[PDB]
Design an enzyme around this catalytic site. Structure first.
Site, short mmCIF file in Angstrom:
data_model
loop_
_atom_site.label_atom_id
_atom_site.label_comp_id
_atom_site.label_asym_id
_atom_site.label_seq_id
_atom_site.Cartn_x
_atom_site.Cartn_y
_atom_site.Cartn_z
N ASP A 148 122.02 17.08 -34.62
CA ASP A 148 122.17 17.24 -36.06
C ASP A 148 123.61 17.56 -36.43
O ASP A 148 124.26 18.37 -35.78
CB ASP A 148 121.26 18.35 -36.57
CG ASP A 148 119.83 17.91 -36.72
OD1 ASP A 148 119.09 18.57 -37.48
OD2 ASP A 148 119.45 16.92 -36.07
N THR B 271 123.04 14.24 -42.76
CA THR B 271 124.04 15.30 -42.72
C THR B 271 125.33 14.88 -42.02
O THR B 271 126.36 15.53 -42.22
CB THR B 271 123.47 16.53 -42.01
OG1 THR B 271 122.96 16.15 -40.73
CG2 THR B 271 122.34 17.13 -42.82
N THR B 272 125.30 13.84 -41.20
CA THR B 272 126.49 13.40 -40.48
C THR B 272 127.15 12.17 -41.09
O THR B 272 128.33 11.94 -40.84
CB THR B 272 126.15 13.10 -39.01
OG1 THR B 272 127.30 12.55 -38.36
CG2 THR B 272 125.01 12.13 -38.92
N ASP C 14 113.22 17.25 -39.73
CA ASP C 14 113.85 16.11 -40.40
C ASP C 14 112.81 15.13 -40.93
O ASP C 14 112.89 14.66 -42.07
CB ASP C 14 114.80 15.39 -39.43
CG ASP C 14 116.16 16.05 -39.34
OD1 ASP C 14 116.42 17.00 -40.12
OD2 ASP C 14 116.97 15.62 -38.50
N1 ADP Z 1 117.02 0.60 -35.70
C1 ADP Z 1 118.21 0.77 -36.32
N2 ADP Z 1 119.09 -0.24 -36.42
C2 ADP Z 1 120.27 -0.09 -37.03
N3 ADP Z 1 120.68 1.06 -37.58
C3 ADP Z 1 119.90 2.16 -37.56
C4 ADP Z 1 118.59 2.07 -36.91
N4 ADP Z 1 118.02 3.29 -37.03
C5 ADP Z 1 118.90 4.09 -37.70
N5 ADP Z 1 120.02 3.41 -38.01
C6 ADP Z 1 121.19 3.95 -38.74
O1 ADP Z 1 121.52 5.26 -38.29
C7 ADP Z 1 122.07 6.02 -39.37
C8 ADP Z 1 121.55 7.45 -39.33
O2 ADP Z 1 122.24 8.19 -38.33
P1 ADP Z 1 121.56 9.49 -37.65
O3 ADP Z 1 122.19 9.63 -36.29
O4 ADP Z 1 120.07 9.37 -37.80
O5 ADP Z 1 122.07 10.74 -38.52
P2 ADP Z 1 121.94 10.84 -40.11
O6 ADP Z 1 120.56 10.31 -40.40
O7 ADP Z 1 122.10 12.31 -40.37
O8 ADP Z 1 123.07 9.99 -40.64
C9 ADP Z 1 121.65 5.32 -40.65
O9 ADP Z 1 122.81 4.92 -41.38
C10 ADP Z 1 120.89 4.09 -40.21
O10 ADP Z 1 121.36 2.95 -40.93
#
Ligand code: ADP
Ligand code: ADP
Ligand code: MG
Ligand code: MG
Ligand code: MG
Lengths: 526, 308, 488, 351, 100, 201
Positions: free
Chosen positions: C23, C56-57, C354
């Site tokens: 996170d 959050t990131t 989350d």
């Molecule tokens: N299967 C996937 N394919 C492409 N992008 C993804 C996929 N799952 C999540 N994402 C991307 O990951 C990002 C989220 O990053 P994450 O590490 O979950 O932290 P946060 O949700 O706090 O930003 C989102 O912008 C989303 O577009």
């Protein structure tokens, strides 16, 4: 490093290369610390404390070793915690899990050196773990419908568990203690019902399991020293100034004779309570609290043995052994059950006296007397008997077994290799590494006995590849043999837990790319 | 070995070894350590030759199993009715110490003690807590003695009486003091007559207990220690002195079993149960004065002697 | 630490404790920083955590990219107020465009599939992804069981999340009842009941006691005997009052006595002792009972009903736990987490939180967009197209905003092991050529660039909040020109 | 409302009072100039008990400062918080007693006690209804003990039925700063017994062994010992100065705490306050008498007192009443009676 | 209240129930008696209780407090009022008068 | 939150206070409630610190025990029978009172800040009562909606719908502590300028 400072003074940060180097060094060091105590011919470690008043112990248990050293590397704390919770869950398997985790990390470092992303390694390891757990599940043998086969399996499990610890000097003898004791529990998993009494003097082979019960308590003065055909009342009530009349009352009079009268009434209250207790028809009384010396003489005049200060554990164990219930308020003699035993006496062991119950009714709790020539020997003997009892209880709860001596690891490795030969890409290179980890647990065992480990492992692999699914190391000579014939048997739960925990710990550690440390809390010197 | 402070972890096990022997035998505490050291010394050359420690352990077990048989074949049966063998064994065990010169005095005593505590027909072990050792400074080693009775170290609170012949002894576990309920109590005065009445009733209360004690014929009284209320007030001591009763107080709570086993008393925790059948009988009860080292109390000639 | 292929951080506490996390909020919370801008970034992340719960990131990365892009403009002779104004106008354009490409989902108990897909997308980036279908379904079921639909509000005090070490991660389950860390008060009581009628009490099992100062004067022997009788009469009276109402199991917030314990045992009526207040109210809500403060006020209509009450025992330790299950329609739900490490338990708790927050957001507003960088690429295209019509020296700020809005696809591509610039340019060209805003970065290498069939879904309020909050924080940072601080 | 005036005598008394008033003033918002800048009016519900309000808004303490040597007033005036006191309340002599009880009680004190009695009259004239006095002094000095005791007697004569409390320091067990300390302590306890309602005995070594071991860092002078004593006194007097869940003046504590009038000596404590009638006092006096006799048997240093007017039998009466006090304390335990003199002779015959 | 220490000592339940109502009724009677003389504003030099303030608000009485012991005397001179050490309904001669 | 999410309520709103068990089992929305504003501590406690009880019989002991419960329940019934649905107090509310109010579908809050309670008085139009012996219809408040709502991690109580209100309340939404502090400092200047401009124009 950027010119601007983001951190306080004393804060620290390590990035990818240094982070992985630190983590792998710590994990491998922890693994090699405890490699030496694996298998039937491992050795023990001396632990002495600089701080704790120079306490000394000699141990072979992996969890005991890891819980006492002062590790400061962050990657070692995960392994220490995983070993601790493995000990808490099944009670056996503490060293194999940490050795396997260290070997997995050691392979992962070279894989990273070959320019492979960590996520690829993680995916390959996940598939390999799935295949290995399936192959292990398909190999289980489930007895339990037949009594004699099940009891023979229990004896084999106890013998296999006790082979690597000191008790192996008398492996048969103590085996008879491990099985029978558990069979006294009648299917209950309460390991607190088995009390272990260790006392100095005598030899290690003089230990035994009592057929009755033993208390290390004392009886009051002017009461019978032995009773035949006893009837026992077990109580948890106050008898030393029982009249804690919990209200906030007080005595306010105008004469001393009134104080004397109220004192006499206070005595009469105890007399009435003791008479109500005696109305039950008892000749033995056991209480967990203290008994003052006026009820002591009241019991003595009635020819009733009284035991005082037998804490909660003693009361519950006596309730299991004899069959009574822990009573109070003593108003309804008909609704309370009394315990029974054929004889109560006093026995003398070493330099101490104990109260001995013989001919008990139920026997659902037991006591074990350990004898030895040193405190460290007694402590290690208890520490090993605990592992034996834990694994036996686990097996009784879920009665399906596997073969030891390297058979199970070779089966898993063969399944993983067959899976890896079918898949394309870099993930295959990961899965093969997984197999090379599982075939390190047998090798290490042989390395502790002075055998040619490479040739033995090659022969074992060749035998398992062609379908001999029960081949394993024969360590009394150092050859390849049938595990079913020789009787090397382990439980399914312990092996499954070892595999799953090691895999998850390696996966957790492998995903770290940056370590951040805050400023330590300074110990106040002066 | 215990008085030193050995620092090496290995040398910290040898001491424990000696402890174990002291529990099992009480003799040969030096020989076991010598033997362990010699065996460990001999192991070095075997290690250098290329032997493995496991083989050494197994061979040591085999040698022990043979040695036990040899020693057992050496032995010779004995019977407890032969006192000469016991005396020889004791004086052999005693001629290595500083008190060897006094062996011709200390050898029989020991034997006597062990034959006055057990039942030889069915004796399978001995309880050494039935034999009490009292250390008293003064004199020489030639003055140790065996008492078939009771010996106490505390003085008598009574001022004047030091000899009782044909003594009747009772043991008390209650207090001869002013009344005090275990519940919070207080006396409220609102008139001037009550002030005199309180004192009069206190005097009567104490006197009644003392007269009840005297009625049974008791000469010697033992009072157990109490640390919450006064176990003996000056008024009660004065009354007991006026009736020619010897008073001994501050008896410890842990030697009551030994006293009862020795002189045959039965502890009394209530005045209603102080009857003539709870008393013990002794032929002499008196305090002796050693020349300068202090006083002592001897009770000798018990009609119903225990095994102490 | 961004995307499904991101790595994690390990923080060693000030006392030596170790935490492995992913996170952004927790990472920035455990860092000890000195620079004030770092603290401002930490607080931005914390605020985004407070309102939404996910994303959050991304916001800190966006803010850092915005500040980086402002540097070249500052070097060319632009007043920072002009840059802030241009950023604000670009943010308004982007937010106006964002809800034009959004689709609704539908929130209803019958279907639950879009919600499961959303929770799967949220959990795909965590270490819990080895079993994330199960955990996603657990989260959606829990939220749908607790949520209030007329007021469109959920309450997290009615969801109890707790874990115990040991076992396997796949043993985590959902309990539509309660589970407490207590056991029965007597070792010989039965370990299970199957038709439990629960009596919930707040008074201890002792004779009464007034609170104000009191004294009870005992002046005789008859008074002593009367008090002695009164005590045991009170004990028998309270036991009889409990038994008369028809109850079968009793639960108390305070302790008992030995007499009370044995009287409860002798009358075949188990009891539990020393349970906390929140547990009392959760049990009351779950079983449908009522909390009574006296034995006199106990009636037959104030008892709760529970289908099963059991005492579960874990492995070779001495611990015990009490589970209350098979209740009727219940507004209280518990998540029971297992695992082989403490760090695993902590990270599982954070990931479940989350997922619950994301499902709550879907409850509040029910329209979504597609992730993988598709939304950011479309917003950048809209911002650049609008900026091409602005000639008043503000086109530079808008183009800077559009360029800094494209660091999320580049970060995803760099983490996934591809080449950033070529992939982003190809996807941009495809989006311009075709007419779908649902083309993103193929992070998991499934062959297709379409995120509508890959089922990558995100909430709209999350995106809107990320953009607006980052823009306002950047505007606040740009305003500062002076700083005074003491030396060390 | 029920005002209390405070009197400090001697160097130690002045040093302790200068910090007592400092730690009180910061609680009530007073400034070193005498003005007020507090926030909560809860500080002003009982402000008049310790401060007198002058025209213009100033607050002046109800304190009198006394010594036989002008050394300490110059420090007090020149020190911190030393300019709020009334300039007319400083009383000093010209020579000093030189650690002699007789000089303080007979020769030099008699010509100066009248000034103190004329100052306390004017300080009492300004209070609606006074309730008692506070005194701070020492038992090992000349001005603190003898002169302080004479002042106590005079105040008791002039003000019959007003309460009186003392905060006296006591000689240390294993170290005596002055050779004639037992004489002064024994001769002052005699008249402390019958002219005070309560005494708060404070030891120097016992509180001195807190800064080294508990405070973790010190090699101090009288300094922080004094501040700790002032903190203890403030913790004692918070009940008088402030209202709370249960407010109670020192009489309302004494009545619950002092059952028997002549056993009114206490031993304090502090845990960041504890006040106890621990009978460990009987151990202190048993030591002091033990020294007194040891010197009086040799008539050591006696001519230094006899020349000032005292008689030889005053020492005898003082030691007799000290023994009476020790026996009265001992009669409350009934457990120390077990430690009677071991019998040494051999006459234990018929009766 | 009394200058010497005083405690409310009760022996039955009815006294325990009635004590608080008795105090409240007494306080109300005192405030109403003060108000019936025609005073609109009350100035005090000490604490004001919560119940007294509630009853002052009930009867529309302006309440001001000041703690100087000197501002009170100067105010008394200003308005021609005489200070009172008791809480009793004052006499006409002790009324102060103020235009605003 | 964003700066455009700030709001003004023509009424009153304040934060949730510390609550005992049972607070989650009582309704959280009303349409035409009556508000009781109090300055009375409602919990089982000693009547007075000066009190002391001396008793001779166990029957009188039981009567004394029952007296305290009777007193507390007397206060609670006096509050209940006035028709109020929301009660507020500057002084603590016990758990017994909380459960009593929950069982009759009512809402309670304790330890409310004094400024917020005065603001509620001004917005709704009642009076603070230090005694419960006369709770008339003219001493109770009246609002048009009461609600408890989730605002960015916190719970807030809203009284809205009062047209006779001499009070408004601001809710400011930001991203960091100094952000909202600077927003408030900026708004203070405008408030003061508007006040000065109303008089002299
Ligand atoms: N299967 C996937 N394919 C492409 N992008 C993804 C996929 N799952 C999540 N994402 C991307 O990951 C990002 C989220 O990053 P994450 O590490 O979950 O932290 P946060 O949700 O706090 O930003 C989102 O912008 C989303 O577009
Ligand atoms: N008689 C035996 N022959 C061959 N292998 C054995 C024998 N006894 C035990 N083992 C092996 O030794 C291992 C036991 O490890 P051990 O040293 O007891 O510690 P842990 O069980 O905690 O790893 C098991 O993997 C088992 O296969
Ligand atoms: Mg093992
Ligand atoms: Mg010898
Ligand atoms: Mg996320």
């Amino acid at each position: 490093l950027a010119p601007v400072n983001i951190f306080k003074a004393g804060a620290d940060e390590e990035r990818a290369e240094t982070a992985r180097l630190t983590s792998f060094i710590g994990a491998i060091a922890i693994g090699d610390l405890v490699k030496s105590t694996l298998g039937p011919k491992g050795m023990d470690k001396i632990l002495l404390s600089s701080g704790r008043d120079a306490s000394l112990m000699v141990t072979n248990d992996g969890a005991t070793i890891l819980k006492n050293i002062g590790v400061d590397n962050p990657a070692a704390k995960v392994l220490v915690d995983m070993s601790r919770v493995q000990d808490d869950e099944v009670g056996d398997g503490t060293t194999s899990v940490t050795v396997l985790a260290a070997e997995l990390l050691r392979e992962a470092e070279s894989l990273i050196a070959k320019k492979i992303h960590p996520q690829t390694i993680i995916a390959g390891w996940r598939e390999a773990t799935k295949a290995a757990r399936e192959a292990l599940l398909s190999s289980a043998v489930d007895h339990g419908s037949d009594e004699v086969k099940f009891r023979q399996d229990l004896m084999n499990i106890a013998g296999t568990t006790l082979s690597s610890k000191l008790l192996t000097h008398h492996k048969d003898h103590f085996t008879k203690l491990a099985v029978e004791a558990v069979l006294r529990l009648k299917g209950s998993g309460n390991l607190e019902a088995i009390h272990i009494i260790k006392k100095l003097g005598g030899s290690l082979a003089d230990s035994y399991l009592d057929e009755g019960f033993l208390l290390d308590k004392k009886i009051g003065v002017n009461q019978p020293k032995r009773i035949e055909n006893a009837k026992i009342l077990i109580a948890n009530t106050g008898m030393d100034t029982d009249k804690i009349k919990i209200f906030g009352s007080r005595v306010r009079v105008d004469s001393t004779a009134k104080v004397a009268e109220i004192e006499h009434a206070e005595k009469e209250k105890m007399k009435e309570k003791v008479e109500r207790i005696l109305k039950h028809g008892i000749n033995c009384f056991i209480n967990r609290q203290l008994i003052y010396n006026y009820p002591e003489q009241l019991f003595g005049a009635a020819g009733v043995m009284a035991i005082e200060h037998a804490d909660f554990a003693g009361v519950e164990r006596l309730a299991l052994v004899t069959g009574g219930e822990i009573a109070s308020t003593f108003d309804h003699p008909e609704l309370v059950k009394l315990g029974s035993c054929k004889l109560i006496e006093e026995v003398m062991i070493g330099e101490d006296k104990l109260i001995h119950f013989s001919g008990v009714a139920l026997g659902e709790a037991c006591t074990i007397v350990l004898r030895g020539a040193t405190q460290q020997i007694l402590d290690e003997a208890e520490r090993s008997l605990h592992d034996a009892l834990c694994v036996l209880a686990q097996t009784v709860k879920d009665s399906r077994t596997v073969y030891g001596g390297g058979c199970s690891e070779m089966l898993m490795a063969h399944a993983v290799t067959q899976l890896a030969n079918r898949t394309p890409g870099k993930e295959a290179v990961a899965m093969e590494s997984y197999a090379k980890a599982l075939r390190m647990l047998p090798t290490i065992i042989a390395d502790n006995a002075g055998y040619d480990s490479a040739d033995l492992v090659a022969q074992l692999r060749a035998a398992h590849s062609e379908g001999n699914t029960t081949a394993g190391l024969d360590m009394r000579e150092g050859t390849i043999g049938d595990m079913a014939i020789l009787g090397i048997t382990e439980s399914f739960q312990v092996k499954r837990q070892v595999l799953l925990s090691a895999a998850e710990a390696a996966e957790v550690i492998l995903r770290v790319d940056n370590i951040i440390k805050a400023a330590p809390r300074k110990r106040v010197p002066d | 070995l215990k008085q030193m402070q050995v620092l090496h972890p290995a040398a910290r096990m040898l001491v424990e070894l000696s402890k174990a022997q002291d529990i099992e035998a009480g003799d040969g505490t030096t020989s076991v350590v010598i033997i362990a050291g010699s065996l460990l010394d001999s192991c070095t050359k075997l290690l250098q030759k290329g032997i493995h420690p496991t083989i050494i352990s197994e061979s040591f077990q085999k040698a022990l199993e043979k040695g036990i048989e040899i020693l057992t074949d050496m032995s010779r049966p004995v019977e407890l009715s032969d006192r000469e063998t016991l005396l020889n064994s004791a004086t052999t065990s005693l001629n290595s110490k500083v008190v060897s010169q006094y062996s011709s005095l200390l050898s029989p005593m020991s034997v006597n003690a062990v034959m006055k505590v057990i039942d030889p027909a069915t004796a399978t072990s001995v309880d050494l807590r039935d034999i009490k050792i009292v250390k008293k400074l003064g004199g020489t080693i030639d003055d140790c003695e065996l008492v078939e009775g009771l010996v106490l170290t505390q003085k008598v609170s009574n001022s004047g009486i030091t000899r009782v012949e044909k003594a009747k002894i009772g043991l008390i576990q209650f207090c001869l003091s002013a009344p005090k309920t275990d519940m919070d109590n207080q006396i409220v005065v609102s008139d001037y007559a009550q002030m005199d009445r309180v004192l009069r009733e206190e005097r009567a209360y104490i006197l009644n207990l003392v007269k009840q004690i005297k009625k049974t014929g008791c000469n010697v009284l033992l009072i157990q220690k109490s640390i919450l209320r006064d176990a003996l007030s000056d008024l009660a001591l004065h009354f007991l002195n006026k009736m020619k009763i010897m008073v001994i107080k501050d008896i410890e709570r842990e030697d009551i079993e030994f006293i009862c086993k020795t002189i045959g008393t039965k502890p009394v925790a209530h005045i209603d149960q102080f009857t003539a059948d709870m008393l013990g009988s002794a032929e002499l009860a008196e305090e002796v004065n050693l020349n300068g080292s202090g006083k002592l109390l001897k009770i000798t000639g018990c009609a119903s002697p225990g095994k102490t | 630490s961004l995307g499904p292929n991101g790595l994690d951080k390990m923080m060693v506490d000030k006392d030596g404790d170790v935490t492995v996390t992913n996170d952004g909020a927790t990472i920035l919370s455990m860092m000890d920083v000195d620079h004030q801008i770092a603290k401002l970034m930490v607080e931005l992340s914390k605020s985004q955590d407070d309102e939404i719960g996910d994303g959050t990131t991304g916001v800190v990365v966006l803010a850092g990219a915005l500040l980086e892009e402002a540097e070249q403009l500052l070097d060319r002779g632009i007043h920072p107020i002009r840059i802030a104004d241009g950023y604000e106008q670009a943010a308004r354009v982007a937010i106006e465009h964002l809800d034009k490409i959004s689709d609704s989902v539908l929130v209803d108990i019958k279907d639950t599939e879009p919600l499961i897909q959303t929770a799967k997308t949220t959990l795909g980036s965590k270490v819990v992804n080895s079993c994330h279908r199960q955990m996603a379904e657990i989260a959606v079921n829990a939220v749908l069981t607790v949520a209030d639909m007329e007021r469109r509000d959920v309450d997290f005090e009615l969801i109890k999340v707790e874990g115990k070490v040991g076992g396997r991660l796949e043993d985590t389950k959902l309990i539509k009842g309660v589970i407490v860390d207590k056991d029965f008060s007597h070792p010989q009581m039965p370990k299970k009941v199957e038709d439990a009628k629960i009596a919930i009490l707040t008074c201890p099992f002792e004779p009464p006691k007034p609170k104000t100062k009191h004294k009870l004067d005992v002046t005789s022997v008859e008074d002593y005997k009367a008090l002695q009788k009164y005590e045991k009469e009170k004990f028998e009276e309270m036991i009889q009052q409990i038994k008369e109402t028809g109850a079968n199991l009793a639960i108390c917030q305070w302790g008992f006595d030995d007499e009370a314990n044995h009287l409860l045992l002798q009358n075949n009526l188990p009891a539990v002792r020393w349970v906390g207040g929140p547990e009392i109210e959760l049990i009351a809500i779950a079983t449908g009972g009522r909390i009574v403060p006296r034995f006199s006020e106990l009636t037959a209509e104030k008892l709760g009903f529970a289908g099963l009450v059991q005492e579960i025992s874990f492995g070779t330790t001495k611990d015990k736990m009490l589970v209350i299950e098979q209740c009727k329609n219940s507004r209280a739900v518990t998540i029971f987490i297992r695992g082989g490490n403490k760090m695993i338990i902590e990270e599982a708790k954070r990931s479940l939180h989350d997922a619950l927050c994301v499902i709550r957001n879907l409850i509040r507003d029910n329209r979504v967009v597609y992730g993988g960088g598709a939304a950011e690429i479309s917003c950048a295209l809209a911002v650049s197209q609008e900026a091409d019509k602005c000639p008043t020296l503000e086109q530079y700020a808008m183009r800077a905003f559009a360029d800094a809005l494209e660091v999320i696809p580049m970060a995803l591509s760099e983490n996934s092991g591809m080449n950033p610039i070529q992939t982003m340019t190809e996807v941009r060209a495809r989006q311009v050529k075709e007419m779908n805003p649902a083309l993103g970065i193929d992070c998991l290498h499934k062959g297709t660039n379409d995120m509508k069939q890959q089922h990558v879904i995100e909430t709209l309020i999350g995106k809107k909040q990320q953009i607006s909050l980052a823009t306002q924080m950047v505007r606040m940072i740009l305003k500062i020109d002076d700083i005074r601080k003491p030396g060390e | 409302m029920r005002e209390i005036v405070h009197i400090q005598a001697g160097q130690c008394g002045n040093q302790i009072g200068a910090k007592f008033w400092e730690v009180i003033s910061d609680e009530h918002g007073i400034d070193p100039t005498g003005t007020y800048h507090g926030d909560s009016d809860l500080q002003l519900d009982r402000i008049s008990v310790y401060y007198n309000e002058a025209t213009g808004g100033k607050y002046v303490p109800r304190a009198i400062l006394v010594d036989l040597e002008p050394g300490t007033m110059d420090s007090v005036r020149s020190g911190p918080f030393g300019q709020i006191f009334r300039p007319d309340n400083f009383v000093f002599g010209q020579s000093g007693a030189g650690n002699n009880w007789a000089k303080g009680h007979y020769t030099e004190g008699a010509e100066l006690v009248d000034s103190v009695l004329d100052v306390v009259r004017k300080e009492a004239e300004s209070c609606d209804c006074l309730q008692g006095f506070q005194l701070t002094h020492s038992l090992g000095g000349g001005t603190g003990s003898g002169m302080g005791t004479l002042l106590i007697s005079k105040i008791r004569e002039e003000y019959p039925d007003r309460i009186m409390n003392t905060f006296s320091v006591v000689p240390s067990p294993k170290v005596s700063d002055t050779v004639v300390e037992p004489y002064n302590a024994t001769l002052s306890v005699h008249q402390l017994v019958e002219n005070t309602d309560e005494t708060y005995c404070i030891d120097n070594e016992a509180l001195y062994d807190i800064c080294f071991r508990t405070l973790k860092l010190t090699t101090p002078t009288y300094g922080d010992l004094n501040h700790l004593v002032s903190a203890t006194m403030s913790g004692v007097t918070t009940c008088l100065r402030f209202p709370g869940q249960l407010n109670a003046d020192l009489r309302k504590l004494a009545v619950n705490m002092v059952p028997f009038p002549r056993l009114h000596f206490f031993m304090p404590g502090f845990a960041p306050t504890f006040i106890g009638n621990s009978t460990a006092i009987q151990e202190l006096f048993k030591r002091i008498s033990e020294q007194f006799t040891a010197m009086f048997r040799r008539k050591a240093f006696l001519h230094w007192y006899t020349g000032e007017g005292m008689d030889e039998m005053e020492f005898t009466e003082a030691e007799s009443n000290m023994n009476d006090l020790v026996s009265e304390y001992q009669q409350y335990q009934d457990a120390t009676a077990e430690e009677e003199e071991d019998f040494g002779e051999e006459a234990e015959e018929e009766a | 209240i009394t200058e010497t220490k005083g405690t409310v000592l009760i022996k039955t339940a009815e006294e325990l129930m009635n004590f608080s109502k008795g105090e409240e009724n007494l306080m109300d009677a005192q405030v109403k008696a003060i108000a019936d003389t025609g005073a609109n504003v009350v100035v005090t030099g000490g604490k004001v209780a919560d119940m007294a303030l509630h009853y002052a608000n009930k009867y529309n009485i302006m309440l001001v407090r000041l703690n100087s012991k000197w501002d009170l005397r100067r105010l008394c001179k200003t308005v021609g009022a005489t200070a009172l050490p008791r809480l009793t309904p004052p006499v006409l001669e002790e009324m102060g008068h103020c235009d605003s | 939150g964003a700066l455009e999410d700030s709001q003004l309520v023509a009424g009153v709103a304040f934060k949730k206070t510390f609550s005992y068990a049972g607070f989650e089992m009582q309704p959280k929305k009303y349409h035409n409630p009556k508000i009781a504003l109090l300055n009375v501590e409602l919990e089982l406690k000693a009547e007075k610190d000066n009190a002391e009880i001396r008793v001779h019989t166990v029957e009188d002991y039981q009567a004394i025990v029952d007296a305290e419960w009777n007193i507390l329940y007397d206060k609670l019934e006096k509050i209940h029978h006035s028709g109020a649905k929301v009660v507020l107090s500057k002084l603590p509310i016990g758990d017994v009172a909380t459960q009593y109010f929950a069982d009759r579908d009512m809402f309670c809050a304790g330890r409310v800040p004094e400024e917020d309670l005065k603001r509620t008085m001004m917005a709704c139009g009642g009076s603070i009562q230090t005694s419960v012996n006369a709770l008339s219809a003219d001493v109770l408040g009246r609002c048009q909606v009461f609600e408890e709502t989730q605002i960015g991690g916190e719970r807030y109580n809203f009284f809205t719908g009062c047209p006779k209100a001499k009070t408004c309340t601001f809710i400011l939404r930001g991203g960091a502590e100094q952000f909202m502090e600077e927003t408030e400092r900026s708004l203070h200047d405008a408030i003061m300028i508007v006040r000065r401009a109303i008089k002299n124009d």
